[PDB]
């Protein structure tokens, strides 16, 4: 076992005798005094403290849940010519319900990791929504160029966010063709990221401008997808809800969920109250908190009491009992019996 | 080394043997093509982890050896152990698993030598403060030195 010994070497250069530091308080006194012979009196060997038996985690109750049901569970997803941007803020956003369900297959969250998402505190979430073709999964990515990247909707080069999208064939495919979903082939400008071109101007290619009519080398850019259920998986409807993130501009107001833990009283616990951590014994108090105050401090900046979240109780933080370990001994001539203070 | 091929479970329900619904294979491939850029290219890493003296010293360098001198103040190099002192004969009978003897507070007391296995003692060279007995510059400039 990983113990600590006290070896006595000799004039030969060999070990003669030893004690174990964790066997009894007599040999603990021999360890902390570094001799086999203790004298008669009191000696402080080590420090005793009560360990935290179990931990409790506490955080304010989630009554403001973010509108992820308004951006995932919707009948009419708007198309990519009129892609709908909603600002998700002043609530608690749950990405665990997103990650733990697998209606999608193509997470690919650039920037932040897909696993550690509910712990980081973002400030501003831009929830975009558009429907594109089934084979355009590679185009919604940082760095990749093409029709959907350049002339439809561009993701930035330093894009931090998840590219959440499911390939639905039941909802957005009509037998004969859903001609409501629309995209652009011809456009005379590569689009900068987070830009929305809803204008319906006539594209001129070859020589002579048409300017209001359609004909030779004058193509209307607004063209239909025409989704059919007999198509392959590259031509199926592909419902995209991309989530843009912070970009260091705001204070934090949208955060991940925090699982609360039921509290136990009159025991040494390792608590967490609203970001304030510590170890102590929680008990009831008769100190009248004013209703805006969350934690109370004593003389010289030590947290004496904290106001309990989710029930508005006032709990007194008592530190766990500690003290030095004193060993009463008569000396190694007299006896090996000890008393522990 | 994590050589095991157990599939990773992410979302809810453990598949336990079938790659599929919330069940991704952990071992995904590089797939190197020479048309890739330098940030996508292979990189043959050969890392040389040392420890600095968990053991007796075995991996030395190509520096040439030097003949030994007795009872003089020298700057020795005993398999990477650099120190100063005189090298005298010792009567400390070591057991044959020791390579060096160690004094109080991380100072080396006795070292057995390479290529000979003859035991040596390290005593530090003679030091001490200097002191001046003077009667004062007003009386005389004659100086006793202690």
């Amino acid at each position: 076992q990983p113990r600590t010994f006290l070896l006595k070497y000799n004039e030969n250069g060999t070990i003669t005798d030893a004690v174990d530091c964790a066997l009894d308080p007599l040999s603990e006194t021999k360890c902390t005094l570094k001799s086999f012979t203790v004298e008669k009196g009191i000696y402080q060997t080590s420090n005793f403290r009560v360990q935290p038996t179990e931990s409790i985690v506490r955080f304010p109750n989630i009554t403001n849940l973010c509108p992820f049901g308004e951006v995932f569970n919707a009948t009419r997803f708007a198309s990519v010519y009129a892609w709908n941007r909603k600002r998700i803020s002043n609530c608690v956003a749950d990405y665990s319900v997103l990650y733990n369900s697998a209606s999608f297959s193509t997470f690919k969250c650039y920037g932040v990791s897909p696993t550690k998402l509910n712990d980081l505190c973002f400030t501003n979430v831009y929830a975009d929504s558009f429907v594109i073709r089934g084979d355009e999964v590679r185009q919604i990515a940082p760095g990749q160029t093409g029709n959907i990247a350049d002339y439809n909707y561009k993701l930035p080069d330093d894009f931090t966010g998840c590219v959440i999208a499911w390939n639905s064939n039941n909802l957005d495919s009509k037998v004969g063709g859903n001609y409501n979903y629309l995209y652009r082939l011809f456009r005379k400008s590569n689009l900068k990221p987070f830009e929305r071109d809803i204008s319906t101007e006539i594209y001129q290619a070859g020589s002579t401008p048409c300017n209001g009519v359609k004909g030779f080398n004058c193509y209307f850019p607004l063209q239909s997808y025409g989704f059919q259920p007999t198509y392959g998986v590259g031509y199926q409807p592909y419902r995209v809800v991309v989530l843009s993130f912070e970009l260091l501009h705001a204070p934090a107001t949208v955060c991940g969920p925090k699982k609360s833990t039921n509290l136990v009283k009159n025991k040494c616990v390792n608590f967490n109250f609203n970001g304030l951590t510590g170890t102590g014994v929680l008990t009831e108090s008769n100190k009248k908190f004013l209703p805006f105050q969350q934690f109370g401090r004593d003389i010289a900046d030590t947290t004496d009491a904290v106001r309990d979240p989710q029930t508005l109780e006032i709990l007194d933080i008592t530190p766990c009992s500690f003290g030095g370990v004193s060993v009463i001994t008569p000396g190694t001539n007299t006896s090996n019996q000890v008393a522990v203070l | 080394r994590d050589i095991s091929t157990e599939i990773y479970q992410a979302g809810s329900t453990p598949c336990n043997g079938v790659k599929g619904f919330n069940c991704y294979f952990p071992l995904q491939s590089y797939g190197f093509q020479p048309t890739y850029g330098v940030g996508y290219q292979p990189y043959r890493v050969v890392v040389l982890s040392f420890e600095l003296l968990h053991a007796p010293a075995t991996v030395c360098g190509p520096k040439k050896s030097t003949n030994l001198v007795k009872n003089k103040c020298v700057n020795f190099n005993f398999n990477g152990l650099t120190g100063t002192g005189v090298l005298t004969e010792s009567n400390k009978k070591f057991l044959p698993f020791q390579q060096f003897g160690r004094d109080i507070a991380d100072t080396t007391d006795a070292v057995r030598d390479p290529q000979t296995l003859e035991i040596l003692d390290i005593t530090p060279c003679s030091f001490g403060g200097v002191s001046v007995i003077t009667p004062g510059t007003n009386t005389s400039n004659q100086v006793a030195v202690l």
Binding site: A300, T302, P319, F322, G323, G324 | -
Partner: protein
């Protein structure tokens, strides 16, 4: 507080007073002979004389 303990004194406050009452009774009863050897009593006008 954290890391701070106050050790109690070996002589308590009711029992330092027993030493002071013993010194007062010895002084008033015997002059200074209890500080030298055995306590030899004396009347207190003779002591103050």
């Amino acid at each position: 507080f954290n890391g701070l303990t106050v050790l109690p004194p070996l002589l308590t406050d009711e029992m330092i007073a027993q030493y002071t009452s013993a010194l007062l009774a010895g002084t008033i009863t015997s002059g200074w002979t209890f500080g030298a050897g055995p306590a030899l009593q004396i009347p207190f006008p003779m002591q103050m004389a």
